[PDB]
C-alpha cells in the first residue's frame, strides 16, 4: 500500500530551497493506467510570506525532511474496497514543494531567494517515469487537490504536448481537478485577497499558463488562467472537475468564517455562482458541502450527488471516453443551496 520516494535524477529541478524535487511511486505491473496526483497546500507570492512559510511549512518548500515512503489513500489506494475506481493503477504522488500552484519555471539564483519550478517538476517527473513503465501506459490521469487541482488545469495540456513531441501519442492524457475550481469573486468583507495574490505570484514565480488561455488574456493578465471557469474552456484534454460548492479555501479568501441575512445571501450566491460555472462542464462532481479536498481522503467513496458516488462518476467518465450512458451519469452538480443540504456531506 506504500509508495516509495524517488528524488529527481535531474537535480536542476528543485523545491523552493534548492533541494531536489521528486515523487512517490507504487508500480502495478499488468496495468497501463497511471495516476499522477498533484498535492495542494496554498502558495506564497513574496519573499516575506515565503520566509514565513519556510519556518512553519518547510515540507511544502523542501525535500530535506521527506519520509522515504507514504501510504496511498483514497484514489491513490490500491485496495478495491477503498478505491473502486483505479485500485490497480500505477500510483504517483508528487509532493507540492514549489509554492506556485504548480505554475513556476524559475530557478533560484543570485537574484531569486527561492526557486519556483512547479511546472517543470511535473514535466521532469513525467519524463523520468517513462523509463519505469509510463512508456507503455494507455491512460495518464493527472489528478490534484486544492492548489494541486488548479495545477491540473494549468498543466494537463502541457503534459499531453510533452508526450506528443516525445513519440508517445498512444498515452491518453486526462485531468482530474479536485477542489481547485476557484472564483475570483468579491469578498464578504474587505495581505492580498485572492485575485491580487495570483497577480503578484505570477510575476514572483514567473508562472506559466495553458497556451490558448495565455493567448486570450495576453500579457499582464495571465492570472485569469488560474481560475477554472476561464481556463477550462480553452483546454483540449478531458478534465473531470470535482468541487465542493462551498469550498473552505474559497470561503477563507472570501473572509467568510447564527448566520445573518447578509452572510446567508453571500453564501447562497456563492453556491449559485459555482453551479453556473459548471453548467457547461460535462464531467463534474459538485456536492453542496462545506469541506476541502476529497479524492485522497480515505472515505471519499461516501459522498453522493443524486445517488451516484464519485468513484462511480469517474467510472462512467472512463466509459464515456471509450470512443449517452444509461444509469451512469458524469454531470453531477447539487442544486440545493446551503452547506450540508446533501445528506452525504462529511461531518
Ligand atoms: O491549496 C489550497 O489548499 C488552497 S489554494 C487556493 N485557494 C483559494 C484561491 C485560490 C486561487 C487560485 C489558486 C489557488 C487558490
Ligand atoms: C534538467 O532540467 C532542466 C530544466 O527543466 C533542463 O533544462 C535540463 O535539460 C534537464 N537535464 C536533463 C539531463 O534532462
Amino acid at each position: 500500500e506504500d509508495l516509495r520516494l524517488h528524488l529527481l535524477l535531474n537535480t536542476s529541478v528543485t523545491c523552493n530551497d534548492g533541494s531536489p524535487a521528486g515523487y512517490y511511486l507504487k508500480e502495478s505491473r499488468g496495468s497501463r493506467r497511471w495516476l499522477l496526483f498533484l498535492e495542494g497546500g496554498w502558495y506564497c507570492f513574496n519573499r516575506e510570506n515565503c520566509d514565513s512559510r519556510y519556518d512553519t511549512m518547510r515540507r511544502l518548500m523542501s525535500s530535506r525532511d521527506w519520509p522515504r515512503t507514504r501510504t496511498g489513500t483514497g484514489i491513490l489506494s490500491s485496495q478495491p474496497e477503498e478505491n473502486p475506481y483505479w485500485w490497480n493503477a500505477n500510483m504517483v504522488f508528487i509532493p507540492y514543494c514549489s509554492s506556485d500552484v504548480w505554475s513556476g519555471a524559475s530557478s533560484k539564483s543570485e537574484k531569486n531567494e527561492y526557486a519556483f519550478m512547479g511546472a517543470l517538476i511535473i514535466q521532469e517527473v513525467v519524463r523520468e517515469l517513462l523509463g519505469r513503465g509510463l512508456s507503455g501506459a494507455k491512460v495518464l490521469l493527472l489528478a490534484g487537490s486544492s492548489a494541486g487541482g488548479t495545477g491540473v488545469l494549468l498543466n494537463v495540456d502541457r503534459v499531453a504536448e510533452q508526450l506528443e513531441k516525445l513519440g508517445y501519442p498512444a498515452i491518453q492524457v486526462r485531468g482530474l481537478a479536485d477542489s481547485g475550481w476557484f472564483l475570483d469573486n468579491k469578498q464578504y468583507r474587505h495581505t492580498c485577497a485572492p485575485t491580487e495574490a495570483i497577480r503578484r505570484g505570477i510575476r514572483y514565480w514567473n508562472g506559466v499558463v495553458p497556451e490558448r488561455c495565455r493567448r486570450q488574456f495576453q500579457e499582464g493578465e495571465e492570472w485569469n488562467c488560474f481560475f477554472g471557469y476561464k481556463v477550462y474552456p480553452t483546454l483540449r484534454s478531458p478534465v473531470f472537475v470535482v468541487q465542493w460548492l462551498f469550498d473552505e479555501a474559497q470561503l477563507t479568501v472570501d473572509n467568510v468564517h447564527p448566520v445573518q441575512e447578509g452572510l446567508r445571501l453571500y453564501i447562497q450566491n456563492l453556491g449559485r455562482e459555482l453551479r453556473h460555472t459548471l453548467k457547461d462542464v460535462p464531467a463534474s462532481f459538485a456536492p453542496a458541502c462545506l469541506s476541502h479536498e476529497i479524492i485522497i481522503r480515505s472515505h471519499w467513496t461516501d459522498v453522493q450527488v443524486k445517488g451516484t458516488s464519485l468513484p462511480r462518476a469517474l467510472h462512467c467518465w472512463d466509459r464515456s471516453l471509450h470512443d449517452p450512458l444509461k444509469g451512469c451519469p458524469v454531470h453531477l452538480v447539487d442544486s440545493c443551496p446551503w452547506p450540508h443540504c446533501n445528506p452525504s456531506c462529511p461531518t
Side-chain angles (χ1 to χ4, degrees), residues 116-160 162-189 191-199 201-202 204-316:
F116 302 98
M117 306 178 69
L120 299 175
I121 293 173
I122 295 173
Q123 306 283 294
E124 183 60 41
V125 158
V126 166
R127 197 188 67 83
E128 296 188 12
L129 283 180
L130 292 172
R132 287 179 178 257
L134 186 63
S135 51
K138 185 185 55 179
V139 186
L140 199 171
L141 181 55
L142 185 67
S145 298
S146 294
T150 312
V152 168
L153 299 175
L154 297 174
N155 291 277
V156 61
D157 276 8
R158 186 173 292 106
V159 168
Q162 171 200 8
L163 294 177
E164 283 164 29
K165 290 183 112 196
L166 258 54
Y168 298 100
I171 308 172
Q172 300 159 44
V173 179
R174 300 165 186 173
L176 174 59
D178 173 21
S179 300
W181 183 277
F182 300 103
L183 299 182
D184 52 342
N185 62 338
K186 316 310 122 202
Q187 296 181 306
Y188 171 67
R189 289 192 184 101
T191 201
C192 295
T195 198
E196 195 62 46
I198 306 301
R199 283 163 160 166
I202 283 191
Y204 189 55
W205 314 321
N206 194 4
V208 289
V209 295
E211 177 178 48
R212 176 181 279 98
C213 186
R214 181 196 322 148
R215 285 164 165 172
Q216 290 176 1
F217 297 99
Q218 295 181 340
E219 191 50 60
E221 300 289 337
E222 299 93 356
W223 65 266
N224 284 274
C225 301
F226 281 68
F227 292 88
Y229 74 99
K230 302 191 235 199
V231 59
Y232 172 86
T234 78
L235 307 181
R236 293 180 180 178
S237 308
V239 177
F240 193 104
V241 180
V242 176
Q243 185 61 44
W244 303 115
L245 296 192
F246 311 97
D247 182 81
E248 269 160 16
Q250 174 78 49
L251 290 180
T252 297
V253 307
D254 288 331
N255 295 125
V256 176
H257 303 308
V259 180
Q260 289 214 120
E261 178 183 17
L263 182 48
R264 173 208 315 151
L265 291 172
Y266 187 89
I267 295 305
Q268 294 177 319
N269 178 70
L270 169 64
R272 174 198 71 78
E273 282 178 340
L274 199 141
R275 299 208 311 260
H276 183 256
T277 60
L278 298 181
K279 303 259 187 185
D280 292 330
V281 183
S284 48
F285 189 86
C289 313
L290 169 56
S291 184
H292 193 55
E293 307 189 334
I294 170 168
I295 62 171
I296 58 161
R297 310 195 91 155
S298 286
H299 296 278
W300 75 305
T301 64
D302 287 338
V303 69
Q304 282 189 351
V305 171
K306 308 188 183 331
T308 301
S309 74
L310 179 53
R312 170 156 189 82
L314 295 173
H315 158 71
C316 308

